[model samples]
Target: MNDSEFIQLADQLYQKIEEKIEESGADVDYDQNGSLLTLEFENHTKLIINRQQPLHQVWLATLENGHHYDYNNGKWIDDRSGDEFLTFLSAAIFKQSKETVDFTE
Candidate 1:
């Protein structure tokens, strides 16, 4: 996808994630600084998702590990392990909460 397409998709994903957090019914704190999204858990830990324009990738940093993915077809494919974004996100969020969300973007 082109830069505009990537940006649009990223924006949509961010909005959905922000919405899910509010509707999740979990005690979670999130901060969006431009294209960088931060999720702070009750355990005093944090996970991050950010857009890397120069690198043309989405960077996700969880408590367990850091993953980089590129948008492909209908999903984001991890640089390694071939994990999809939704699955990776579900697992990452589960590590920090009792609530659940879907990355339907």
Candidate 2:
């Protein structure tokens, strides 16, 4: 995909996730600013997700580690591990929140 396509897709994904987190009623707080979305947990820990426009990928950073994911056909997979992006996201959020939130639409 081109830069514009990537931007649109990333925007849509972030918007959906932001809405989903709000709907889950979790104790965490979040902020959506342009292409970056951050989730801050009660313990003061944070999980950040942002679009990498130049790379045409989505990146996530947490206390444990950071992962870069590229869209592969239909799903986002980690650049190194090939794990599903949403799967890691769920795990990361749980680690930070101690609460489970479904990320799949």
Candidate 3:
């Protein structure tokens, strides 16, 4: 995808996630700054999601590690693990906060 397209998709994904978190009432607070989304837990731990416009990829950074995801077949998939973005995010959020947020697609 071109840079513009990537930004559009990334922004949409960011908005979608923010809405879901609100709906779920998960114990997390989030803010979006352009292409970067910050998710902070009650303990002040953070999970970051950002867009890499040059690569046309989205990146997720947890306290323990980081992951790169490429949009493919209508989903963002982990480059190394082949996991869908939301699935991996659900697991990561739970690992950090012990709170469950249903990341249904």
Candidate 4:
């Protein structure tokens, strides 16, 4: 995808996540700054999700580890781990905040 396409996709993904958090009514705080989205939980831990413009990928950093995801046919999948973005995010969010949110597109 081109730069614009990547930006559009990233923006949609970020907005989806933000909306899902609101809908779930979890006590998580979120901030979207340009290409970076930050989620802070009640325990003071943070998850950072950012866009990689040059590489056309998405990067996510949880309290435990960092992961890089490339846009697949219909999902963002970890290049090495083969984990889907929303699935990994659900696990990470639950691990950090003890809230069960089923993140989906």
Best by TM-score: 4
lDDT top scorer:
4
> RMSD in angstroms, all models?
1.8, 1.2, 1.1, 1.0
Model 4 regions lying over 4 Å from their true place: none
lDDT at position 21, candidate 3: 92
Worst 10 residues of 1 by lDDT: 96-105
Give lDDT: candidate 2, residue 101: 77
lDDT of each: 0.82, 0.86, 0.90, 0.91
Q: Which stretches of candidate 1 lie over 4 Å from their true place?
A: none
Residues 1-96 of candidate 4: C-alpha lDDT, one tens digit per residue: 999999898888998898899999998899999889999999999999999999999999987778999999778999999999999998899988
Rank by TM-score (best first): 4, 3, 2, 1
C-alpha TM-score for every candidate:
0.87, 0.92, 0.94, 0.95
The true-versus-predicted C-alpha distance at residue 100 of model 2, in Å, is 1.1
Model 4 lDDT, residue 16, Cα: 85
Candidate 2's residue-wise lDDT over 19-98, tens digit each? 77888888878898877888899999998898889999999998878999999967789999999988888888898789
Give lDDT tens digits, candidate 1, residues 40-87.
888888989999976778899987789999878777899898888878
Question: Per-prediction count of colliding residue pairs?
Answer: 0, 0, 0, 0
Model 4 global lDDT (CA atoms, 0 to 1): 0.91
